[PDB]
Scaffold this active site. Structure first.
Site, PDB file in Angstrom:
ATOM      1  CB  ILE A  37      -1.068   0.070   1.156  1.00 39.10           C
ATOM      2  CG1 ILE A  37      -0.450   0.355   2.533  1.00 39.10           C
ATOM      3  CG2 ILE A  37      -1.886  -1.206   1.195  1.00 39.10           C
ATOM      4  CD1 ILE A  37      -1.461   0.863   3.520  1.00 39.10           C
ATOM      5  CB  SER A  38       3.768   2.329   1.506  1.00 38.16           C
ATOM      6  OG  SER A  38       2.830   2.510   2.548  1.00 38.16           O
ATOM      7  N   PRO A  44       9.812   1.900  -1.053  1.00 37.62           N
ATOM      8  CG  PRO A  44      11.809   1.880  -2.231  1.00 37.62           C
ATOM      9  CD  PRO A  44      11.059   2.668  -1.209  1.00 37.62           C
ATOM     10  CG  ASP A  45       8.084  -5.065   0.427  1.00 41.53           C
ATOM     11  OD1 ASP A  45       8.654  -5.135   1.535  1.00 41.53           O
ATOM     12  OD2 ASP A  45       7.395  -5.993  -0.036  1.00 41.53           O
ATOM     13  CG  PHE A  46      12.682  -4.017   4.267  1.00 38.25           C
ATOM     14  CD1 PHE A  46      13.362  -5.129   4.736  1.00 38.25           C
ATOM     15  CD2 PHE A  46      11.598  -3.548   4.990  1.00 38.25           C
ATOM     16  CE1 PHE A  46      12.959  -5.771   5.889  1.00 38.25           C
ATOM     17  CE2 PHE A  46      11.191  -4.187   6.146  1.00 38.25           C
ATOM     18  CZ  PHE A  46      11.873  -5.299   6.596  1.00 38.25           C
ATOM     19  NE  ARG A  47       9.285  -8.972   5.651  1.00 37.79           N
ATOM     20  CZ  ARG A  47       8.914  -8.084   6.571  1.00 37.79           C
ATOM     21  NH1 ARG A  47       8.310  -6.958   6.219  1.00 37.79           N
ATOM     22  NH2 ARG A  47       9.151  -8.327   7.854  1.00 37.79           N
ATOM     23  CD  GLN A 106       2.169  -7.467   7.279  1.00 42.47           C
ATOM     24  OE1 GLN A 106       1.440  -7.218   6.317  1.00 42.47           O
ATOM     25  NE2 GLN A 106       2.888  -8.566   7.359  1.00 42.47           N
ATOM     26  CG  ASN A 107       3.285  -0.771   5.418  1.00 39.33           C
ATOM     27  OD1 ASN A 107       3.709  -1.903   5.203  1.00 39.33           O
ATOM     28  ND2 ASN A 107       2.439  -0.155   4.597  1.00 39.33           N
ATOM     29  CG  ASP A 109       4.864   3.767   5.482  1.00 38.70           C
ATOM     30  OD1 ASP A 109       3.867   4.069   6.174  1.00 38.70           O
ATOM     31  OD2 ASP A 109       4.798   3.039   4.467  1.00 38.70           O
ATOM     32  CG  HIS A 126       5.816  -6.016  11.493  1.00 38.08           C
ATOM     33  ND1 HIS A 126       6.021  -6.448  10.201  1.00 38.08           N
ATOM     34  CD2 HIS A 126       5.223  -7.043  12.148  1.00 38.08           C
ATOM     35  CE1 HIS A 126       5.558  -7.681  10.076  1.00 38.08           C
ATOM     36  NE2 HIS A 126       5.068  -8.065  11.242  1.00 38.08           N
ATOM     37  CB  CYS A 139      15.578   6.251  31.149  1.00 35.82           C
ATOM     38  SG  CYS A 139      15.431   7.887  30.422  1.00 35.82           S
ATOM     39  CB  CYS A 160      18.561   8.963  26.543  1.00 31.49           C
ATOM     40  SG  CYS A 160      17.257   9.531  27.599  1.00 31.49           S
ATOM     41  CB  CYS A 163      19.896   8.037  31.113  1.00 29.98           C
ATOM     42  SG  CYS A 163      19.261   7.026  29.721  1.00 29.98           S
ATOM     43  CG  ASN A 225      -1.401  -8.230  -2.694  1.00 34.00           C
ATOM     44  OD1 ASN A 225      -0.873  -7.238  -2.189  1.00 34.00           O
ATOM     45  ND2 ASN A 225      -0.751  -9.374  -2.872  1.00 34.00           N
ATOM     46  CD  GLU A 227       2.210 -10.147  -6.596  1.00 33.96           C
ATOM     47  OE1 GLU A 227       2.124  -9.938  -5.364  1.00 33.96           O
ATOM     48  OE2 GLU A 227       2.850  -9.400  -7.365  1.00 33.96           O
TER      49      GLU A 227
HETATM   50  C1  LIG Z   1      14.021   5.915   8.204  1.00 31.05           C
HETATM   51  C2  LIG Z   1      12.526   5.887   7.887  1.00 31.05           C
HETATM   52  C3  LIG Z   1      11.648   6.679   8.598  1.00 31.05           C
HETATM   53  C4  LIG Z   1      10.291   6.630   8.289  1.00 31.05           C
HETATM   54  C5  LIG Z   1       9.300   7.493   9.053  1.00 31.05           C
HETATM   55  N1  LIG Z   1       9.888   5.811   7.329  1.00 31.05           N
HETATM   56  C6  LIG Z   1      10.755   5.059   6.673  1.00 31.05           C
HETATM   57  S1  LIG Z   1      10.162   3.950   5.350  1.00 31.05           S
HETATM   58  C7  LIG Z   1      11.545   3.286   4.349  1.00 31.05           C
HETATM   59  C8  LIG Z   1      12.249   2.150   5.095  1.00 31.05           C
HETATM   60  O1  LIG Z   1      12.044   1.019   4.822  1.00 31.05           O
HETATM   61  N2  LIG Z   1      13.178   2.544   6.135  1.00 31.05           N
HETATM   62  C9  LIG Z   1      13.940   1.629   6.969  1.00 31.05           C
HETATM   63  C10 LIG Z   1      15.109   2.118   7.525  1.00 31.05           C
HETATM   64  C11 LIG Z   1      15.881   1.319   8.351  1.00 31.05           C
HETATM   65  C12 LIG Z   1      15.467   0.028   8.628  1.00 31.05           C
HETATM   66  C13 LIG Z   1      14.295  -0.452   8.082  1.00 31.05           C
HETATM   67  C14 LIG Z   1      13.853  -1.875   8.397  1.00 31.05           C
HETATM   68  O2  LIG Z   1      12.557  -1.736   8.950  1.00 31.05           O
HETATM   69  C15 LIG Z   1      12.047  -2.827   9.676  1.00 31.05           C
HETATM   70  C16 LIG Z   1      10.754  -2.728  10.193  1.00 31.05           C
HETATM   71  C17 LIG Z   1      10.213  -3.776  10.917  1.00 31.05           C
HETATM   72  C18 LIG Z   1      10.962  -4.921  11.114  1.00 31.05           C
HETATM   73  N3  LIG Z   1      10.449  -6.038  11.880  1.00 31.05           N
HETATM   74  C19 LIG Z   1       9.722  -7.120  11.261  1.00 31.05           C
HETATM   75  O3  LIG Z   1       9.489  -7.153  10.099  1.00 31.05           O
HETATM   76  C20 LIG Z   1       9.288  -8.228  12.211  1.00 31.05           C
HETATM   77  C21 LIG Z   1       9.816  -8.418  13.477  1.00 31.05           C
HETATM   78  N4  LIG Z   1       9.218  -9.466  14.006  1.00 31.05           N
HETATM   79  N5  LIG Z   1       8.320  -9.960  13.110  1.00 31.05           N
HETATM   80  C22 LIG Z   1       7.467 -11.115  13.341  1.00 31.05           C
HETATM   81  C23 LIG Z   1       8.353  -9.221  12.010  1.00 31.05           C
HETATM   82  C24 LIG Z   1      12.250  -5.022  10.616  1.00 31.05           C
HETATM   83  C25 LIG Z   1      12.793  -3.973   9.888  1.00 31.05           C
HETATM   84  C26 LIG Z   1      13.517   0.343   7.254  1.00 31.05           C
HETATM   85  N6  LIG Z   1      12.044   5.095   6.943  1.00 31.05           N
HETATM   86 ZN   LIG Z   2      17.188   7.635  28.953  1.00 31.38          ZN
END
Ligand SMILES: Cc1cc(C)nc(SCC(=O)Nc2cccc(COc3ccc(NC(=O)c4cnn(C)c4)cc3)c2)n1
Ligand SMILES: [Zn+2]
Length: 288
Positions: A37-38, A44-47, A106-107, A109, A126, A139, A160, A163, A225, A227
């Site tokens: 959806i994004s 992009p979908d990092f997957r 799950q996003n 963003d 997530h 803290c 922080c 602390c 979706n 697919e």
């Molecule tokens: C830096 C930033 C700031 C904002 C507001 N938006 C974005 S969007 C672009 C992007 O992808 N930015 C981005 C930057 C750095 C790192 C990542 C990785 O993000 C994640 C998000 C969640 C998970 N955890 C699961 O999936 C999970 C855990 N357990 N289970 C069961 C499942 C893992 C990695 C994304 N990026």
């Molecule tokens: Zn702290």
């Protein structure tokens, strides 16, 4: 019941779903959404493949010892703008129309929030970059994204102010539990749901994927979706779109924005959706 009982949809099509939505039988909709959806918002979908070891950068243990890689990756992947999609604003319309029980996402963003979904409406399964916390148990000072953004771009490892412990974005790193909110809301919400709208997710990550099995047997489930997804794996409840026993699951295959536009059009909501999107996009573009 299942296929043996009288079904709620008059036909297994987007048109049948729309008629159901505008009937008195459909009062409460849960949305389950993922990276799909994004992508049209330029996130992009990092997957998606088209986008010590690689997996270390998302592990909580590694992060707490060596946070610099994560934060370098965060700067590189930081979106250039946060403009929610038609799909996001369609969920805002569901809220406005009194139909939205909950959006489980799950996003990370924050686009659901930017589009006008409030905390009460959201389960960020997530986690999210929207807020961050000092990692010291005694803290736990909370920091807003504005504060975290500045650290990320300045290339200063966030610490922080109270602390001097590490400050971690509220995403669920691997090795961390999903938020308690996910389990508590799931337990309540799925007793109350009339329609499950599943958008932009392949339903491959658990326990988020298992949510579809938490719906009552009669509850229609519409997948928008690119697919088909959610069907039981022939090797390894599940979606049944196509068998002779199909009775409640509908797949609309294409881009999420186009599916939501098609549904809104059927509902008589297209002008409202267009007006909302154009106004909010204009506002975001004009941020000074
Ligand atoms: C830096 C930033 C700031 C904002 C507001 N938006 C974005 S969007 C672009 C992007 O992808 N930015 C981005 C930057 C750095 C790192 C990542 C990785 O993000 C994640 C998000 C969640 C998970 N955890 C699961 O999936 C999970 C855990 N357990 N289970 C069961 C499942 C893992 C990695 C994304 N990026
Ligand atoms: Zn702290």
């Amino acid at each position: 019941g299942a296929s043996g009982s009288e079904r709620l949809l008059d036909e297994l099509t987007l048109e049948g779903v729309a008629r159901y939505m505008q009937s008195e039988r459909c009062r409460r909709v849960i949305c389950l959404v993922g990276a799909g959806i994004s992508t049209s918002a330029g996130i992009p979908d990092f997957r998606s493949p088209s986008t010590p070891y690689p997996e270390a950068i998302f592990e909580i243990s590694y992060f707490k010892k060596h946070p610099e890689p994560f934060f370098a990756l965060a700067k590189e992947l930081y979106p250039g703008q946060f403009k929610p999609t038609i799909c996001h604003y369609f969920m805002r319309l569901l809220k406005d129309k009194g139909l939205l029980l909950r959006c489980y996402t799950q996003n990370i963003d924050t686009l659901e929030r930017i589009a006008g979904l409030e905390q009460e409406d959201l389960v960020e399964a997530h986690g999210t970059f929207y807020t961050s916390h000092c990692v010291s148990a005694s803290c736990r000072h909370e920091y807003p994204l504005s504060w975290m953004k500045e650290k990320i771009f300045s290339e200063v490892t966030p610490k922080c102010e109270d602390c001097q412990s590490l400050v971690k974005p509220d995403i669920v790193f691997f090795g961390e539990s999903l938020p308690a909110r996910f389990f508590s809301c799931m337990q309540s919400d799925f007793l109350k749901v009339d329609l499950l709208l599943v958008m932009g997710t392949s339903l491959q990550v658990q326990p988020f994927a298992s949510l579809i099995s938490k719906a009552p047997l009669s509850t229609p489930r519409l997948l928008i979706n690119k697919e088909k997804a959610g069907q039981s794996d022939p090797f390894l409840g599940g979606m049944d779109f196509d068998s002779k026993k199909a009775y409640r699951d509908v797949a609309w295959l294409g881009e999420c924005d186009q599916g939501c536009l098609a549904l809104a059009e059927l509902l008589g909501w297209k002008k409202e959706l267009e007006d909302l999107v154009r106004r909010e996009h204009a506002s975001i573009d004009a941020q000074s």
